[PDB]
Design a protein around this ligand. Structure first.
Ligand SMILES: [Ca+2]
Ligand SMILES: [Ca+2]
Ligand SMILES: [Zn+2]
Ligand SMILES: [Zn+2]
Ligand SMILES: [Zn+2]
Ligand SMILES: [Zn+2]
Ligand SMILES: [Zn+2]
Lengths: 163, 536, 368, 213
């Protein structure tokens, strides 16, 4: 359930084919982008009482960015990156520092992982609607936020550290 | 107009394939979307029409983070470059700071069995075996010399200050590790204790360590003498054979490449190549040959004749009459085809077996020739080297083996021919034959390794030539047409007899209509004869 | 005519041990000198003891962290440096042995002092066979090279020479030297190397520099089995055109001996005479030349090649018979100075040479 | 096989005194579970296993550990998000994989005995077969090229998918700053568009006119 996803291939190509890693503290960390989400989307409806869920589900993404990042979200080439992150800033917010390109991958993975949880029809419908809205706004300003021009390359030291 | 249609039809005929034309049309269509300029358009069209000058000329008249290189890429802008303390102005203004290359491979990779002969591996193993023992012996001797120097020094001052003398970590040497490394090698685990002893009290410690090091050096020297005695007659058995990189491969590729089917398909590939080119309509005349070879000596021709006759005279399955027939065919007819009995050409329309025989003879002549030039080059090199080394002052311009004399070097080729003959009898084992051939002719000896098989193949060709009625009819027709003078002659008179030559062609078409027929042109020039073979 | 040259040796350099089974062996250098001592070449040549290059001199190109790590690394403290051992690419390919920094100091100091004397115009030819390590990077060791002394030597020369040409005839591509001077107009790196599934995997035909250093770095990729005649036909014109367009003031020639026939990891088929023809061609042009060592993994052939080109540098002809020496039995069973090439196929076809040479010529035409 | 190294080494001796990871499906340094044949990388564990972390003794995988602990024990989206947090905790660190909908999608050689095949296929530059030199087949069009006939010539075998000099994709590959996906979409713009004869002939004669309309 994704719209205008091909961007991912670019990510993939620069991250495991072009050998061009991502910035460690790039900008607009994922929780910050999520809060910008809550702020922008709460200013949509005239009387959005259901904002009692908005922040909630937005907050949910943060916690789903917490435990799940690193396990089945990164690549083999990205393993030393996360190793350095977890060895230098463990006490720092884990769901932070990493950039937006990583975020979308989560929504790529959950579409399969959600197939292992038997929620009710109404809850799954609400969740699907909200991710559909999430990726639709990301499609609206992909160019402004996503930028592959600032993709630096791995020196051979990083090549040894990765594999 | 119709000119563009003709242009497209001819690019159709010259491209032979729809998909590549499709790429061409994608090129011109990307041009048509105003995304390609005229100069850029002619630069992309060049790969398609870069070999047809008329096509390119007509088309031209009709028209009227970053990365560079392939192994260099850029560092981050916000990258903490490693600081350096010794940077002067030239260091900042000259040294690279933005682009980096990465070693994609590593040295000492999988190269053991890539391109080296198995006999080079033995030489390499011997070389590291020598290097280990020599480096340890030389470290021991260097430590011996340094400690001898320090003992000689300590022997020369007053006794009351000998106890005041001390030694540092260098142990009297110019390195802080080498002497310690040698002492560790000599003494095992008790190296720190003796090192402390010689640093604290050199006077009572240097002599005993000298004695031990000298004793170990003597024992290692005698071990090295024995080891070097073993090490010889291993370089001798492997050096020349390692210098030969093709013998094992050459044997099999030659025992395969001399079959009749291989020779046939070699010319068949050229035939279909030129047929495809003709279908393309490319600018190539329809009279060019298919293969060319050259014989540049008649003495080698008679030598080859002697070799084949020498083999065939020792054959039991062929009778005296057939021996005589082969004798006449080889020592009379083949010279006549070669005009041994400028601008003089001879035409011979050959069947399959004649082509097999004659290509095999060309290969034999070429190999004998290569050996002959190799022997001459060795003779000249030996003579000029002797002349150069006779007049040589060496440093004033401010055991071993006995090389063969000149007479042996010039008699190499007669000895080589007798050895090939002996191989033909079988009186010599092929292993010793190969060893001797290599020991005379170095890296070019592999050319003569499979001479005997080639000779028996030629003998079979000759026997089949005698045995089959088609060959006798072919040679009789050649003789009859030569009696009229149409087949072969002066180059100028070709147009006088070309039509007559065509008649000969016609007879060939009605004599081997169910068999392949070759045209062979023997053209004589400046003492050489160029052979020129094509199919029909 | 005959000119005063310089020769650098520290007699301890051969005692350094790279490791068991390691193709890199400093021992070669020692017996090169031994051959030099037994060909009577010491009377016409002045031999000097190279001062150990200080860490401050090494930091002129390498990071202080790299020199710190090289000075503080020992075989006995492998466990306390492992992480940095991984970060600095010292390990399986480039092992740490006893006195590694001393070996690097001697190799670098020889080249640096030779460059200094060439700068002082006290001589017009300097030779350092212990040096030539060209695979070292700014902050890593690779290709058996730990400190890129060629870079430091060229940096020392640049203080008085406006333009300098580095020539590399080692079978490997001089990635460190060209990378250090990729974006500068004061250095041109001419390289001839084997390309394709070969270390370091860099040095394409299209690698011609960057920015201001564009077109000032020319590489010649080759295939297996190049021979003396082809090397001669493609070295003399390329070098002549390079020095016609550049007009350099100093030359640094890396004499990698691993391009000789029969090398343990080399693939070429050159001989000693063909290898020395490059030095003759460079010397015919009469400019301050620094001859360096480098590769060379078939030890006997390395010794023969280096002694022959050392004699060539002196305009001296030595007898083709090898004199009795401490390492005589190495050179068996012929004990002859020059070596014979192998009959391996020359995959380097003439039309490929013509195309590569033409592309290099057009690339060189664009220099100002 | 008489090796001379052993004698030298014993002579020089100082005296002294008396196959693939189960998670990412790739090789490397692996630790194998002692209960199941599955093996995991040092960076394929929850949490990833460092060098100084491995305990002295038997090592156990995560699935077997979960089985052992289970045997021993024997419109608020808050609840859904707790379910996701538990499921993500339960999951193993194998890898991230793109969907297969997006990542997915001989005759010109000497015979076994060594022989030029018939009928032959030839070099596009010379129309000469594989006999002189090995031929390389473009994977997008069956045009065969020589090593030395290219411009510039190729030094070695192209080990991967080789892009022939006639395919137009070179001019689109000229750019070095555009993202990959735009280049791929431009390539696929020419991977389907075929059968356009009338339109290209019409366009070409339209451009051919010396005087613009
Ligand atoms: Ca440069
Ligand atoms: Ca090179
Ligand atoms: Zn090399
Ligand atoms: Zn298990
Ligand atoms: Zn794994
Ligand atoms: Zn071709
Ligand atoms: Zn193609």
């Amino acid at each position: 359930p994704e719209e205008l996803k091909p961007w991912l291939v670019d990510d993939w190509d620069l991250i495991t084919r072009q050998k061009q890693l991502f910035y460690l503290p790039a900008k607009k960390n994922v929780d910050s982008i999520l809060e910008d989400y809550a702020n922008y989307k709460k200013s949509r409806g005239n009387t959005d009482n259901k904002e009692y869920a908005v922040n909630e589900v937005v907050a949910g993404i943060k916690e789903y960015f917490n435990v799940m990042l690193g396990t089945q979200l990164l690549y083999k080439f990205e393993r030393p990156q996360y190793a350095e992150i977890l060895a230098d800033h463990p006490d720092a917010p884990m769901s932070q520092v990493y950039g937006a390109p990583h975020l979308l991958r989560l929504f790529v993975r959950i579409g399969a992982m959600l197939a292992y949880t038997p929620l009710d029809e109404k809850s799954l419908a609400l969740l699907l609607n909200y991710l559909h809205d999430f990726l639709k706004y990301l499609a609206k300003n992909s160019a402004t936020l996503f930028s592959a021009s600032d993709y630096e390359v791995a020196p051979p030291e990083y090549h040894r550290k990765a594999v | 107009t119709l000119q563009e249609f003709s242009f497209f039809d001819k690019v159709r005929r010259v491209l032979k394939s729809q998909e590549v034309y499709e790429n061409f049309l994608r090129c011109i269509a990307l041009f048509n979307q105003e995304l390609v300029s005229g100069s850029e358009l002619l630069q992309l069209v060049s790969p398609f029409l870069g070999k047809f000058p008329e096509l390119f000329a007509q088309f031209k008249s009709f028209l009227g983070c970053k990365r560079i290189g392939s192994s260099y890429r850029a560092l981050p802008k916000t990258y903490q470059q490693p600081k350096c303390s010794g940077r002067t102005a030239i260091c900042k203004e000259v040294l690279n700071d933005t682009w980096v290359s990465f070693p994609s491979w590593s040295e000492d990779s999988t190269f053991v069995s890539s391109k080296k002969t198995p006999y080079e591996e033995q030489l390499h193993r011997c070389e590291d075996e020598r290097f280990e023992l020599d480096v340890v012996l030389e470290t021991n001797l260097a430590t011996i010399r340094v400690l001898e120097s320090v003992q000689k020094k300590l022997s020369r001052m007053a006794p009351e200050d000998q106890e005041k003398f001390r030694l540092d970590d260098s142990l009297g040497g110019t390195s802080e590790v080498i002497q310690r490394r040698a002492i560790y090698r000599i003494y095992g685990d008790k190296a720190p204790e003796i090192i402390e002893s010689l640093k604290k009290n050199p006077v009572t410690a240097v002599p005993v360590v000298l004695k031990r090091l000298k004793a170990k050096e003597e024992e290692w020297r005698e071990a090295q003498q024995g080891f070097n005695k073993i090490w010889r007659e291993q370089y001798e058995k492997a050096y020349l054979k390692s210098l030969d990189h093709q013998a094992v491969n050459f044997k099999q590729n030659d025992t395969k490449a001399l079959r009749s089917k291989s020779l046939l398909n070699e010319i068949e590939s050229v035939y279909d190549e030129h047929q495809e080119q003709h279908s393309e309509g490319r600018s190539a005349p329809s009279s060019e040959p298919h293969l060319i070879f050259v014989y540049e000596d008649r003495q080698i021709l008679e030598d080859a004749a002697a070799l084949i006759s020498y083999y065939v005279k020792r054959q039991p399955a062929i009778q005296k009459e057939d021996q005589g027939t082969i004798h006449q065919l080889l020592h009379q007819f083949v010279p006549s085809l070669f005009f041994s009995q400028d601008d003089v050409y001879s035409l011979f329309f050959a069947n399959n077996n004649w082509y097999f025989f004659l290509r095999l003879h060309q290969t034999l002549c070429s190999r004998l020739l290569k050996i002959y030039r190799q022997a001459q080059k060795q003779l000249l090199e030996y003579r000029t080297e002797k002349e150069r080394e006779k007049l040589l002052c060496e440093g004033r311009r401010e055991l071993r083996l006995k090389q063969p004399s000149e007479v042996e070097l010039e008699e190499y080729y007669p000895a080589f021919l007798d050895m090939v003959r002996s191989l033909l009898e079988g009186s010599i084992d092929p292993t010793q034959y190969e060893d001797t051939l290599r020991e005379m002719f170095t890296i070019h000896a592999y050319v003569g390794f499979t001479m005997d098989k080639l000779v028996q193949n030629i003998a079979r060709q000759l026997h089949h030539l005698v045995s089959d009625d088609v060959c006798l009819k072919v040679v009789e027709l050649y003789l009859n047409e030569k009696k009229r003078g149409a087949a072969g002659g002066n180059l100028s008179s070709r147009c006088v007899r070309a039509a007559r030559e065509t008649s000969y062609q016609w007879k060939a078409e009605r004599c081997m209509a169910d068999e392949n027929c070759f045209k062979v042109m023997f053209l004589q020039r400046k003492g050489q004869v160029i052979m020129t073979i094509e199919l029909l | 005519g005959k000119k005063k040259v310089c020769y650098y040796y520290d007699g301890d350099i051969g005692n350094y041990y790279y490791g068991q089974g390691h193709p890199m062996k400093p021992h070669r250098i020692r017996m090169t000198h031994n051959l030099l001592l037994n060909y009577g070449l010491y009377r016409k040549m002045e031999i000097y003891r190279p001062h150990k290059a200080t860490a401050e001199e090494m930091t002129k190109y390498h990071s202080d962290e790299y020199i710190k790590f090289l000075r503080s690394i020992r075989p006995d403290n492998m466990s306390e440096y492992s992480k940095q051992m991984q970060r600095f690419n010292v390990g399986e390919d480039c092992p740490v042995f006893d006195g590694l920094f001393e070996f690097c100091q001697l190799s670098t100091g020889g080249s640096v002092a030779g460059a200094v004397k060439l700068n002082r115009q006290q001589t017009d030819m300097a030779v350092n066979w212990a040096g030539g390590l060209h695979h070292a990077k700014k902050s890593e060791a690779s290709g058996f090279c730990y400190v890129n002394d060629i870079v430091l030597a060229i940096l020392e020369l640049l203080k008085y020479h406006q333009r300098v040409l580095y020539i590399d005839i080692d079978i490997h591509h001089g990635d460190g030297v060209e990378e250090a001077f990729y974006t500068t107009d004061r250095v041109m790196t001419v390289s001839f190397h084997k390309y394709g599934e070969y270390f370091p995997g860099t040095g394409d035909l299209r690698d011609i520099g960057a920015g201001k250093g564009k077109y000032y770095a020319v590489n010649f990729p080759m295939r297996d089995g190049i021979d003396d005649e082809s090397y001669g036909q493609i070295f003399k014109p390329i070098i002549s055109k390079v020095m016609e367009m550049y007009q350099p003031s100093a030359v640094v020639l890396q004499c990698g001996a691993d391009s000789l026939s029969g090398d343990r990891l080399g693939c070429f088929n050159l001989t000693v005479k063909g290898h020395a023809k490059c030095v003759e061609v460079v010397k015919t042009f009469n400019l301050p030349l620094l001859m360096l060592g480098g590769g060379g993994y078939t030890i006997r052939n390395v010794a023969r090649c280096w002694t022959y080109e050392t004699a060539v540098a002196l305009d001296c002809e030595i007898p083709n018979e090898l004199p009795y020496n401490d390492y005589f039995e190495y050179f068996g069973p012929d004990f002859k100075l020059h070596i014979s090439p192998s009959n391996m196929t020359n995959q380097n076809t003439p039309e490929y040479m013509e195309k590569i040479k033409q592309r290099l010529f057009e690339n060189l035409r664009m220099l100002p | 096989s008489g090796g001379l190294m052993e004698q030298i080494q014993a002579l020089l001796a100082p005296p002294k005194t008396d196959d693939s990871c189960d998670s990412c499906k790739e090789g490397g340094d692996l630790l194998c579970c002692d209960h199941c044949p599955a093996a995991f990388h040092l960076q394929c564990c929850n949490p990833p296993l460092s060098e100084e972390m491995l305990p002295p003794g038997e090592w156990m995988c995560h699935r077997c550990t979960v089985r052992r602990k289970k045997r021993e024990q024997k419109p608020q989206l808050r609840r859904p998000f707790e379910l996701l947090i538990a499921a993500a905790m339960e999951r193993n660190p194998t890898q991230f994989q793109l969907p297969n909908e997006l990542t997915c999608t001989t005759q010109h050689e000497l015979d076994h005995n060594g022989l030029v095949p018939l009928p032959v296929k030839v070099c596009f530059t010379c129309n000469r077969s594989c006999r002189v030199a090995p031929l390389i087949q473009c994977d997008y069009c069956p045009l065969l090229f020589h090593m030395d006939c290219l411009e510039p010539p190729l030094t070695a075998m192209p080990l991967g998918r080789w892009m022939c000099p006639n395919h137009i994709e070179h001019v689109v590959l000229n750019q070095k700053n555009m993202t990959l996906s735009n280049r791929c979409q431009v390539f696929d713009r020419f991977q389907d568009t075929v059968s356009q004869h009338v339109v290209k002939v019409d366009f070409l004669n339209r451009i051919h006119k010396k005087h613009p309309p």
